[PDB]
Design a protein around this ligand. Structure first.
Ligand code: AJP
Ligand code: CLR
Ligand code: CLR
Lengths: 388, 380, 157, 390
C-alpha cells in the first residue's frame, strides 16, 4: 500500500508529540553539540552517497532516520535516566539523542539499498530502544567507561545492523548487483562525509567528557589516533590492491577507524603515542576487513553489509573495547577490568539479539521492500531526474 | 619510457608505514601531555583544521579527472604534516608538551604545505608529496628559528610569514617538475572548499594573537576585507577573461585576496575602512594579475605570490605608523623568500629522482594513475 | 643466469649485450616468471630497435604472458606508439584477446593513448570485441572520461 | 553594455568604504560560534540550496556569494545608522549577526527570481531590499516592540513577499508554461542537499543568536531543534502523500524540511514547550509541502508570479504561520507583549515587503542591466565560462 509510509511517519510523529507533552520540560557545550550534529547529518549522510544510483535515498533517509531518532532517543534515554518521571532537556540530552541517531545510522549502513523508508522508521524505533537500554546498562549498572562509545554506539550499531542484514538476506544479491557500484562524482560526494567525520570526531569523543583533564585528553587522543589512522589506512589500501592503487572504499571509511578504536580510551591517560598506536592498528584492521572479511561475510556467511560498517564500526569498536580493557590493566584508568569486558560483551550481545528481533519484524512483506532487481535504486522511492 | 604507471605496491606502503612508525617512536620518546576556555581555545584549532582538510582539500578538486587525488592527498598530507610539525616545533623551540595551542600551530605549519601543494597537485604521486611535506615543514621551521635567533622574535610568532613562504616554495617546486581541464561538478565542489576557506579565514588571521582586543580587531578586519575582495573578484573577473565571462576558477582563488592582503597587519589596522581599502586593492591586484601574469605554471599560485608580497609591503607601510625597523623588516622578508626559494629548489630536485616512480608527463591530472577503477586491464 | 641477463638487457634496451647473449646461444624465446619474453619487455620499454632485432631473430610474434598479453597488448597499454607501429608492420594480430578478453584497442582506449587508438582503428581493430565484463573500448573510454578517445571511437565507427 | 556590472560593483564598494570610514568604528567570543554557524548558513546553506538547477549551479552559488558579501557591508551601515540615528557607532558581534540576517533576507528574495536576472540586477536588489528590510525590522523591534527573535515575520515572510513582488513585476510570458533549463539533475540535487542540511543543522544558532543570554537563548535552541525534527517527518510524509505513486520529491525534501525552523522563529524564545515547537514544526512541514504541490502551480500559471525556488512555500507561508503562532502564544500567556503588536508586525512585514518589492522590481525591469533573454534563463553560460564537461 502506497499510504503505509506517510501513515507510519505521521503516527510516529504524533506519538513523539504526545510523549514530549507528557514527559519533557525545559551553553558551553553547544559548539561541541553542533560538531556532533554535523557528523550525524552531513558526515554519515554523505558518507553513504557512494552508491551510483542511491544518493537521494542515502542522504535523505539519513536525514529522516536521524530526525526521528533524535526525538525518540530523547524520550527513551530521558525516561531511563528519570525512571519514568518528567525530565528537563539540556544540551547533554541533545548530544545523547544525536548519539542514538548515529547508532541507527551505523546500522542503516549495513542494510543500505535493500530496505524501504518504512522499514527504516521501524528500525529506528526498535533499535533506539535496544541501544538506550544497553547504554544504560553500561553506564549505570556496569559503570564502565566508554566515553567515545566504541562499544555502545559503534560496535552495537555495527552488529545490530549485521543481524538485521542477516535476517534480510537475499540469495539473489550474494554474488553482487549491477546497481551496487560507485561512480566517480559519487565517490567525490562521499569524501565530503568522510572529511566532516574526520574533522569533527574529536568533538564526538569529548562532547560529554568530564570537563577538565578528561575532556582535553579525549580531544587530543582522538585527534592523534585519527592522524595515525589516515597514514595506515592509505598504506594498507595500497598494500592490498593490485599495483598499489588506492581504493576509494578504504580512503572513505578506514581513515575514520581511529576515531572508533580510540573511543573507549579517549579520556584515559594513554598518551598521544598510545592513541597513535591505536589509530594505526585501527586503520590496518579496517582496510583488512574491507578487503578480506566483507567478501567472506557476504558470500559464505550470507551477511551482506553494503557500506562495510563491520570494518569501520564493528571491528574497530571491538578493538576499542579491548584497548579499554588493556588500558585498565595498565592502570591508565580506575574502572574495573571485568566491567569493561562485561560492557563489551553486553554491547555485542544485545546488539545481535535486538537486531535479530528487529530484522524478523522488518522481514514481514508489509513495508514496501524493493525487489532484488530494484535494490540500490533511488527510483523505487524517489522521483529521479532525467540526467546526472 | 612506459606511460603505464609502475607498481607502487611496495614503495608507498613501506614509505608510509615506516613514516608512521618513526613518528610514533619519536612521540613516545619526546612528547608529553598537558580549563574554563578549553572549548573556546579548541574551536580556533578546529577552524584551522576545517580550512586545512575541507577548504584546501576541495579547493584544488576543480580538475576534470583529478578530484579524488586532490581531496584524498590533501587529507594524507595534513595527517602527516601535523604530526611532523608537532615534533619539529618541539625540537627547534626548546621535551615537547602537547597542548591544543601546539596542535593549532602545527596545523598552521601543515596548511603552509597544503597551499604549496596546489602548485604541484596533478603532477606528483603520494610519495613525492610525503617528501614535500617533510622538507617544507622542516624548512619553515628552520626559517622561523633563524628569524628568532637573528631578529629576536618568538619562534611561534614568526609563523606569520607562512603565506609568503608557502606561495614561493610551491612555485619553485612546480618550476622544477617535468612539463605537461575543468568540469562543472568538480567546479562546484571546489566552490564548497573555497567558501569554507573564505568563511573561516578570520581564524587564520588570529591564531597566534594572545590578547582579546587584537583578536577581535584582526577578525573584524579580515571579515570586512574578505567581503570587499569577493565583490571585486566576481565583478572584475569579466574584465580579465578573453570571453568577458566570470571564471569560476579565478573566483575560487580571488575570493581570499583581501584575507592574504590583511593577513600580517589586521591586528594593526585600526579602523574597518582601511581594511576595506586593502581588500579592494587586493581584489584589483588579483584582476590585474589574472590579466597580465599569463603573458609573462599555475596562474592563481602566481597571483597569490604577489598578494602575499603585497601583504608584507602593507605590513611595512603600517608598522612605521604604529627607518631602521623598515630595514629589519625588509631583511626578514628577504630572508623568508630566499629560504622559501632555496628549499623549494632542493625539494624539486629531490622530487625529480627516479625512485619516486612519478607519473609520466602524458598522465598528469589523472586519478587513474593512483586509484583503482573497475573494468580496467591491470599489469602486463 | 645467461637468460636472465638477456632479459635484463632487453628491458634496459642494451641491444649490444642482448645480441652478444644471443650469439653465445641464449634462447630467443626465453621468458621471466611473468611470461614476458624479450619482445614483451622490449615492447614495454619502447625499445624499437630491440623489437626489430628480436623479430629478425625468429621470436614468436603472438606469444602471450600468463595474463594472456601479446607484445602488442603490452605496447598498447604502455603507450609505445612507434613500437605498436613496428609490431603491426611485422604482422601483429591487432584483434587478439587476453584471458579477461581485453584487446589492444581496449588497452589503448583505457589508458587514453590516442595515437595508438588511431593506428589500431586504421589497421582494422574492431571496437566491438567486448571483454568478459561486457565492456567495449568506447565504454571504458567513457568511464574514464577519455573524451578525445571517445570522440575518435564514435567518429570512426 | 559590458562594464555595467564591474562599474556598479566598484562604485558600490567605494561607497561602502566611504560610509564605513564616516560612520563605523571598532560578549564577542561568547556569541562568535553562533555567528559562525549563521555565516555558514548564509554562504553555504542558501548558496548551495539553490544549485538544484541543472545548468545554473555557478550562478546560484556565486551570485549568492556576491549578494551576501555586499549585503553584510550594506546591512551593517544601514542597520547601524538606524540604531544610532545618524551618529558614528561601534560594531560588535551583534552588528555582524544582524548584517548576515539582512543578507539572508536578500537571499530569500533572490530565490524567487533565480535564473531570470543578471548579477547587476542582484546588486541593485540587494541595495534596495536591505533598506526596506532594515526599516521594517526597526519598526517591528522599536516602535511596535514585538517579539520576533527567529524573524519568521521580519526575515522570512518579508523576504518571500518582497521576492514574489519583484518576480511578478519581472514576469515573463514566455516562462509561464515552464522552461527546458528549469530542471534539476542528480548531482545538482545532491549539492542542493548540502545546502539544505547545513541550513537544517545550524538553524538553532540562527534563531538563538540574538536571544537574551540564559533561559531565552536555550529555549530558542531547543525549540528550533525539535521543531525542525518534527518538520522532517511531516515533510517526508506529505511529499509521499501528494506525489504520483508515493515517490518522494527532492524539491520537498530540500525545502519543506526547513519550514519548521522558519515557522518556530517568532515563538523560538517563548515558553511554548518542546511539544508546542513540534506541533508548529509538524504543521510547517505539511503547509510547505502542500504549497509546493498546489500553490506554486497556481501562483505561476494563474497569478503570473513565477517563484523559481518556491520561497513562498518555505519562507512565505511558514513565515505567516510563525507570526500567527506568536499571536496565539501571547494569547496563551506564553509571552509578554501584546497580541495587537504581534499582529501589527505581521501586517507591516508583509505590506512593506510587497510595496518595496514592487518599486524595486520596477527599477530592475528597466532594459539596462543585461538580464537574460527568455531562451537563456536558468543558464550559467550567459555570465559564466561553463566547462564543456559536466
Ligand atoms: C506575493 C505578492 C502578491 C501581489 C503581487 O506581488 C507579489 O503579485 C505580483 C503579480 O501579480 C504581478 C503582476 C504579474 C503579471 C504582470 C504582467 C505584466 O505584463 C505582461 O508581460 C508579459 C511579458 O513579460 C506578457 O507577454 C505581456 O507583455 C503582459 O501581459 C505586467 O507588466 C506586470 C504584471 C501585471 C505584474 C504587476 C505586479 C504584480 C501585480 C505583483 C503584485 C504586487
Ligand atoms: C551480528 C552477526 C555478526 C552475527 C549474528 C547474526 C546471525 C544470527 C545471522 C547472520 C547470518 C544469518 C543467516 C544468513 C542466511 C540465512 C538463510 C535464509 O534462507 C534464512 C535465514 C538465515 C539462516 C540467516 C539467519 C540469521 C543469521 C544466522
Ligand atoms: C586491541 C588489542 C588487540 C590490543 C592491541 C592494542 C594495544 C596496542 C593498546 C591497547 C591499550 C594501550 C595502552 C593503554 C595505556 C598505556 C599507558 C601509557 O602510559 C603508555 C602506553 C599504554 C601502555 C598503551 C599502549 C598501547 C596499548 C597496549
Amino acid at each position: 500500500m502506497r499510504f503505509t509510509f506517510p501513515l507510519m511517519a505521521i503516527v510516529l510523529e504524533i506519538a513523539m508529540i504526545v510523549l514530549f507533552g507528557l514527559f519533557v520540560e525545559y551553553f558551553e557545550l553547544y559548539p561541541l553539540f553542533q560538531d556532533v550534529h554535523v557528523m550525524i547529518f552531513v558526515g554519515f549522510g554523505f558518507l553513504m552517497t557512494f552508491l551510483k544510483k542511491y544518493g537521494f535515498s542515502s542522504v535523505g533517509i539519513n536525514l529522516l532516520v536521524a530526525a526521528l531518532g533524535l526525538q525518540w532517543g530523547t524520550i527513551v534515554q530521558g525516561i531511563l535516566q528519570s525512571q519514568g518521571q518528567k525530565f528537563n532537556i539540556g544540551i547533554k540530552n541533545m548530544i545523547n539523542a544525536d548519539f542514538s541517531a548515529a547508532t541507527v545510522l551505523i546500522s542503516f549502513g549495513a542494510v543500505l539499498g535493500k530496505t524501504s523508508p518504512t522499514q527504516m522508521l521501524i528500525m529506528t524505533i526498535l533499535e533506539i530502544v535496544f541501544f538506550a537500554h544497553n547504554e544504560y546498562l553500561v553506564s549505570e549498572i556496569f559503570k564502565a567507561s566508554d566515553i567515545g562509545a566504541s562499544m555502545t554506539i559503534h560496535a552495537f550499531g555495527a552488529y545490530f545492523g549485521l543481524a538485521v542484514a542477516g535476517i534480510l538476506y537475499r540469495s539473489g544479491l550474494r554474488k553482487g548487483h549491477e546497481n551496487e557500484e560507485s561512480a566517480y562524482y559519487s565517490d567525490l560526494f562521499a569524501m565530503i562525509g568522510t572529511l566532516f567525520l574526520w574533522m569533527f570526531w574529536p568533538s564526538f569523543n569529548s562532547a560529554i567528557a568530564e570537563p577538565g583533564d578528561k575532556q582535553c585528553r579525549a580531544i587530543v587522543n582522538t585527534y592523534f589516533s585519527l592522524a595515525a589512522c589516515v597514514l595506515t589506512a592509505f598504506a594498507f589500501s595500497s598494500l592490498v590492491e593490485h599495483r598499489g592503487k588506492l581504493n576509494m572504499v578504504h580512503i572513505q571509511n578506514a581513515t575514520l577507524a581511529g576515531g572508533v578504536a580510540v573511543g573507549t580510551c579517549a579520556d584515559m591517560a594513554i598518551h598521544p603515542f598510545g592513541s597513535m598506536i591505536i589509530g594505526s592498528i585501527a586503520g590496518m584492521v579496517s582496510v583488512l576487513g574491507y578487503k578480506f572479511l566483507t567478501p567472506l561475510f557476504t558470500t559464505k556467511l550470507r551477511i551482506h553489509d553494503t557500506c562495510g560498517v563491520h570494518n569501520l564500526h564493528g571491528l574497530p569498536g571491538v578493538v576499542g573495547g579491548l584497548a579499554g580493557i588493556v588500558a585498565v590493566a595498565m592502570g591508565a584508568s580506575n574502572t574495573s577490568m571485568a566491567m569493561q569486558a562485561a560492557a563489551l560483551g553486553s554491547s555485542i550481545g544485545t546488539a545481535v539479539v535486538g537486531g535479530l528481533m528487529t530484522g524478523l519484524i522488518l522481514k514481514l512483506p508489509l513495508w514496501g521492500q524493493p525487489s532484488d532487481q530494484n535494490c540500490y535504486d533511488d527510483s523505487v522511492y524517489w522521483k529521479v531526474p532525467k540526467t546526472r | 619510457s612506459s606511460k603505464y604507471p609502475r607498481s607502487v605496491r611496495r614503495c608507498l606502503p613501506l614509505w608510509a608505514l615506516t613514516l608512521e612508525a618513526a613518528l610514533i617512536l619519536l612521540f613516545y620518546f619526546f612528547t608529553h601531555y598537558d580549563q574554563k576556555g578549553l572549548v573556546a581555545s579548541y574551536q580556533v584549532g578546529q577552524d584551522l583544521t576545517v580550512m586545512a582538510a575541507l577548504g584546501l582539500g576541495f579547493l584544488t578538486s576543480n580538475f576534470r579527472r583529478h578530484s579524488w587525488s586532490s581531496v584524498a592527498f590533501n587529507l594524507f598530507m595534513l595527517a602527516l604534516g601535523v604530526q611532523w610539525a608537532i615534533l619539529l616545533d618541539g625540537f627547534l623551540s626548546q621535551k615537547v608538551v602537547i597542548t591544543l595551542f601546539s596542535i593549532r600551530l602545527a596545523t598552521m605549519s601543515a596548511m603552509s604545505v597544503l597551499i604549496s601543494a596546489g602548485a604541484v597537485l596533478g603532477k606528483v604521486n603520494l610519495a613525492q608529496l610525503v617528501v614535500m611535506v617533510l622538507v617544507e615543514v622542516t624548512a619553515l621551521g628552520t626559517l622561523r628559528m633563524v628569524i628568532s635567533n637573528i631578529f629576536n622574535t618568538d619562534y611561534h610568532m614568526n609563523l606569520r610569514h607562512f603565506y609568503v613562504f608557502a606561495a614561493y616554495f610551491g612555485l619553485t617546486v612546480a618550476w622544477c617538475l617535468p612539463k605537461p581541464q575543468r568540469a562543472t561538478i568538480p567546479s562546484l565542489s571546489a566552490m564548497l572548499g573555497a567558501l569554507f576557506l573564505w568563511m573561516f579565514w578570520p581564524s587564520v588571521n588570529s591564531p597566534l594573537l594572545r590578547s582579546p582586543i587584537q583578536r577581535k580587531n584582526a577578525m573584524f578586519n579580515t571579515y570586512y576585507a574578505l567581503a570587499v575582495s569577493v565583490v571585486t573578484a566576481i565583478s572584475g573577473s569579466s574584465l580579465a577573461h578573453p570571453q568577458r565571462k566570470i571564471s569560476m576558477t579565478y573566483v575560487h582563488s580571488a575570493v581570499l585576496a583581501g584575507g592574504v592582503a590583511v593577513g600580517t597587519s589586521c591586528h594593526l589596522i585600526p579602523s574597518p575602512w582601511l581594511a576595506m581599502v586593502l581588500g579592494l586593492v587586493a581584489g584589483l591586484i588579483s584582476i590585474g594579475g589574472a590579466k597580465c601574469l599569463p603573458v609573462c605554471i599555475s596562474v592563481m599560485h602566481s597571483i597569490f605570490s604577489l598578494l602575499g608580497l603585497l601583504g608584507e609591503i602593507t605590513y611595512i607601510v603600517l608598522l612605521v605608523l604604529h627607518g631602521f625597523q623598515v630595514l629589519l623588516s625588509i631583511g626578514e622578508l628577504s630572508l623568508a623568500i630566499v629560504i622559501a626559494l632555496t628549499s623549494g629548489l632542493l625539494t624539486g630536485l629531490l622530487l625529480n629522482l627516479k625512485i619516486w616512480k612519478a607519473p609520466h608527463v602524458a598522465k598528469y591530472f589523472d586519478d587513474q594513475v593512483f586509484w583503482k577503477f573497475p573494468h580496467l586491464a591491470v599489469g602486463f | 643466469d645467461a637468460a636472465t641477463s638477456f632479459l635484463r638487457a632487453a628491458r634496459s634496451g642494451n641491444l649490444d649485450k642482448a645480441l652478444d647473449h644471443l650469439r653465445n646461444g641464449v634462447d630467443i624465446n626465453t621468458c621471466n616468471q611473468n611470461g614476458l619474453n624479450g619482445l614483451h619487455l622490449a615492447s614495454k620499454e619502447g625499445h624499437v630497435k630491440m623489437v626489430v632485432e628480436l623479430l629478425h631473430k625468429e621470436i614468436i610474434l603472438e606469444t602471450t604472458t600468463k595474463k594472456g598479453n601479446t607484445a602488442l597488448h603490452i605496447a598498447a597499454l604502455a603507450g609505445q606508439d612507434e613500437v605498436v607501429r613496428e609490431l603491426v608492420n611485422y604482422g601483429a594480430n591487432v584483434n587478439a584477446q587476453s584471458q579477461k578478453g581485453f584487446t589492444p584497442l581496449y588497452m589503448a582506449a583505457q589508458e587514453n593513448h590516442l595515437e595508438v587508438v588511431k593506428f589500431l582503428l586504421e589497421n582494422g581493430a574492431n571496437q566491438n570485441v567486448a571483454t568478459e565484463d561486457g565492456f567495449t573500448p568506447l565504454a571504458v573510454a567513457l568511464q574514464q572520461g577519455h573524451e578525445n578517445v571517445v570522440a575518435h571511437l564514435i567518429n570512426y565507427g
